[PDB]
Amino acid sequence: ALRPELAFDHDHIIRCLMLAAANYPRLEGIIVQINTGYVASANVIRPVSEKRYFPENLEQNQSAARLVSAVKARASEADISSIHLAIAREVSPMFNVHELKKIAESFEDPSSIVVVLEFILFALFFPTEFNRIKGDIQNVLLLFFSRWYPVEYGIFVQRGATYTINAAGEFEFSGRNEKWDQALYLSEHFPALFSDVP
Amino acid sequence: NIAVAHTDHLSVVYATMSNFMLNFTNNFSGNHATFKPDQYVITSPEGSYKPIIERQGETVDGLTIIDTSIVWPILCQCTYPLVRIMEEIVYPDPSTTLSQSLSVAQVLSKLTLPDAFINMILSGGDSVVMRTYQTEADDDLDEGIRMTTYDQYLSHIRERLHITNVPDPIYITGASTPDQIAASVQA
Amino acid sequence: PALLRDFTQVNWLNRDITNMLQQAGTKYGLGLTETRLDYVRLVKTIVGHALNIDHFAASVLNINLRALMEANVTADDRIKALQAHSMISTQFHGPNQGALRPELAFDHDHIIRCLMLAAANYPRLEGIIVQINTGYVASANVIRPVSE
Amino acid sequence: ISVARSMRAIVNHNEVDRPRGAVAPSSYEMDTGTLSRNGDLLYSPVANGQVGIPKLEVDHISFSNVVSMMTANIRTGDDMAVERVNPDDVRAINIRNA
């Protein structure tokens, strides 16, 4: 059944989206908003009022206090907007490279494992957004390893904190310990923690 | 407790959203070890270089920085339609997100049009300035040896040759036979 | 006077100025002459204008700017000073303004000299420094007087 | 006495081409020259294949110069925002290791 209108011009539209992506900073947000609204319309997730951060008794437990402070330091309050955004940006195109909201953490206390879990969950719930911020995550994880697993750490970092991939497809580790920066996300380099090379 | 809400409901919202009109990029291959985003620039022989993806750091938009802490409320203070005991699932009308995708597209084409238009003009379009020195007496102005500056060739001829998948044209030294030039031209 | 050309109604002057300006050895210009964009932001940073100004002032001004630019010290380097005045292992994050916010490197040599000299001329300098330290200890809330 | 005198008698004479004692400005006042990579000002080269004479090398005065300057994009001396993050526990701080 004929619709008396012009055909959707795939080619022209993609070219213009590229041009806008290269020239119009607001573009990212625009697309994200669409996605956000969609999540909001799907009614998939809402913030309940009561928190369930801790097992029964543990919050009032006096020997749990450092742990409870750690979790509470990590656990931000639920908001529909930040959450819908977190879901939506998994699908939304990225034009400005994302950065991790930096965490200072020495990893002395066992409770510091919370931060590690915070990443793992983020890598499960949001593999894409994770893959974007993951070298910046490696900077934190390297502290975690050097503190918790010093000898494995020395070995790993002796192999190199980053690697590249030759035309053959084999990984080539730097052999050098160096802090990752998102300047690198657009480069040939990968953070080495995620190589999954034994 | 919440895992069913994720796998058996939210997954579909992702699968739909990935098919949305303006979600045009390939964000992630599922392999952290190997994946890199495809990288593009709008680029001109005249010297423009506008990367599509670039690292400018924190912006006014508030999208660039990621608080990962968001995972906590998602685990420990969100309800879902699947958890719990029955709540009707919502299947959103396609028309709203579709029509806003479309209105965004037209808003963009309208927005980039003035730049696309002025630049079409500033480029000088699909033609080149060309001198024609005459090799003989009783030569018409049209007749002679056609020649153009390398800058014109770069702006206008070269990318087209690149795009047509043909070998780059031969240089002509003082020892160039007409047959070589012929082979080059036919190439 | 180069601007006078073909505007001065004085004939010989316009002839002489035209003659000088037509020599190979001299060329008037009223800049902008040289843009320099940033390597990341791709926006202009340091432009060179051909101002009408005596070459002495131009030289001093260019020396000043040369110093500021060639130091390769951004505002981010200030973090290093802050760390010195912070409790050990304070962390300092962001915002990575980069090349767009240059500053001069802290001048170790001149400061240590001026301090030695001051300490020689003004022994009471001791009491200034101590006072700074005192305030810090007081701010650190490490110890308090008590009635008990 | 007239050591400061760049110009003189900017007037036409009716009988003659230039008034006697009329003085034109020196060419040096009008050579904008260039800014060298060092940041020193230079006069234009007298000829091809020659570098320009530095303006500070000779005794002539020059009134067109290339002053480098910063645009609105570069800014210096502004105060800078930062997120300080204090140590989690004072007792865990390491004063010592080299």
Binding site: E77, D79, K101 | - | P95 | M80, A81, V82, E83
Partner: peptide
């Protein structure tokens, strides 16, 4: 506490 996608500055360094 609250979620904040942004650098959460508090100090200002003088030049």
């Amino acid at each position: 506490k609250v979620i904040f996608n942004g650098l959460d500055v508090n100090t200002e360094v003088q030049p």
